[PDB]
Design a protein around this ligand. Structure first.
Ligand code: 8YD
Ligand code: GDP
Ligand code: MG
Length: 170
């Protein structure tokens, strides 16, 4: 059979949400993708032997809350919390994203993965250990990725799927 998973990618402007999503759906890097485009994208893959249909919402635009947007954020089953390893502000923003997800899902038990993107870049400002400690306090996996080289990209999305599977067993 197959299973479908609704995945949502969140994080500050410019951390690489669109680049990560396009790497997964199209298997290549983009230098430039309209930062205002918020949309969902479908991709069939195979995860641990099971046909998996991923429906990936790539968030964008500006901060604002509507019934429309709360509803389609709430339909997400799991969330990638993306920061860039060379941008401390994006790391400091993760708390905001996690608390907004908890609000819209009305739950403290939401599948999430912390993603430190742009790992190919030399100018790191967020120590891997700091991100690991945060993920440990959240109870979630942490994966470092590069949308440019594709390092860790499949691992981030597939790990989120596995976190969803565990949640659905409850
Ligand atoms: C450069 C443009 C870009 O990529 N973004 C990212 C999305 N933006 C944004 N900024 C601050 N907070 C945001 C949010 F809180 C949400 C959000 C969450 C996380 C959960 C539930 C929501 N319901 N409505 C909005 C919700 C989103 Cl989707 C985006 C946020 C700025 C521009
Ligand atoms: N070197 C490098 N650049 C990246 C990476 N991911 C995204 N970018 C670049 O960072 C910028 C912002 O990426 P984008 O996907 O638009 O971020 P978004 O605002 O979160 O959707 C783009 O110029 C991308 O080419 C990465 O992993 N490594
Ligand atoms: Mg984008």
């Amino acid at each position: 059979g197959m299973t479908e998973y609704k995945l949502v990618v969140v994080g500050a402007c410019g951390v690489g949400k669109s680049a990560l999503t396009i790497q997964l759906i199209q298997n290549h890097f983009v230098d430039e993708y309209d930062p205002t485009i918020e949309d969902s994208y479908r991709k069939q893959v195979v995860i641990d032997g099971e046909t998996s249909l991923l429906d990936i919402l790539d968030t964008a635009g500006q901060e604002e809350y509507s019934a429309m947007r709360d509803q389609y954020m709430r339909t997400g089953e799991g969330f990638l919390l993306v920061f860039a390893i060379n941008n401390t502000k994006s790391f400091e923003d993760i708390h905001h994203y996690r608390e907004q997800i908890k609000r819209v899902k009305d739950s403290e038990d939401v599948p999430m993965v912390l993603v430190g993107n742009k790992s190919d870049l030399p100018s790191r400002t967020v120590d891997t250990k700091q991100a690991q400690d945060l993920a440990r306090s959240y109870g979630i996996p942490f994966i470092e990725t590069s949308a440019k080289t594709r390092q860790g990209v499949d691992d981030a999305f597939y790990t989120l799927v596995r976190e969803i599977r565990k949640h659905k067993e409850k």
